[model samples]
Target: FVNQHLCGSHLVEALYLVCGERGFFYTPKA
Candidate 1:
């Protein structure tokens, strides 16, 4: 588990994961 923070963007958390080139998926909540 980890906790992180980023600046200059609202999606800082997502961006952090993205920058790591981590495998991820997204889905629309219906």
Candidate 2:
């Protein structure tokens, strides 16, 4: 599995997406 920091970043990104604007966003991590 990915390391802790990276996993945390992943979770943060997911959360950001969950809260971010609809229809458009730049998520290179996805």
Q: What is the C-alpha lDDT of each candidate?
A: 0.50, 0.57
Candidate 2 local lDDT, 1-30, one digit each (tens): 234454456766765666676634555577
Which ten contiguous residues of candidate 1 have the minimum total lDDT?
1-10
What lDDT score is found at residue 15 in candidate 1?
A: 56
Query: Would you list the clashing residue pairs of candidate 1?
Result: none
Best by lDDT: 2
Q: How many backbone clashes does candidate 1 have?
A: 0
Error of 2 at 8 (Å): 0.5
Candidate 2 has a TM-score of: 0.39
Q: What is the C-alpha local distance difference test score of candidate 1? A: 0.50
Model 2 regions more than 4 Å off: 1-6, 21-30
